Design a protein around this nucleic acid. Sequence first.
RNA 1: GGUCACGCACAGGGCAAACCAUUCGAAAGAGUGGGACGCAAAGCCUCCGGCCUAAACCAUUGCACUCCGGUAGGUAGCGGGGUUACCGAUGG
Length: 87
Amino acid sequence: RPNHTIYINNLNEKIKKDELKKSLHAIFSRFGQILDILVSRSLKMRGQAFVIFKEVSSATNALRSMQGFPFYDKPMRIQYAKTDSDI
RNA sequence: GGUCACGCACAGGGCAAACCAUUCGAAAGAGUGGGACGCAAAGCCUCCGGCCUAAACCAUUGCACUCCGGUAGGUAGCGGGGUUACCGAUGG
Ligand SMILES: [Mg+2]
């Protein structure tokens, strides 16, 4: 079930792609080193985020420690990634 | 000569990329002035495709690692297509 990547859900879609990544990096980096943050604003990708960690353990902490956390007046919905491409 | 093509020139020369200044714009970008990388339609039109922007509105709770909702705006110097047009290689 666990994964290097965490699937953040229910995000404010009004945030600019640049700020969104930036803020997510500014909030999740305290859990572990981040490879890259995948954010896209297409109809299929809106309000969603993929945060890829070096270590699954750091992804595990980030999920458990910050599930529900209000972010741009909206509660984050963190769950594990189903499948993970890249490293 | 007219027309339909064509560009190896000729003559008048035309336009003006990047960058800078300034204006408008949420932005992409455009206007104007300076400036020239190039352009035989780099004149003009967003009909078809591509690409860029996403402030408002509409819709979307969506598992990606080609890239993508509508609506709107932009690019005609991204192609196609439409339309107009100067010169005329003893030119075809
Ligand atoms: Mg011609």
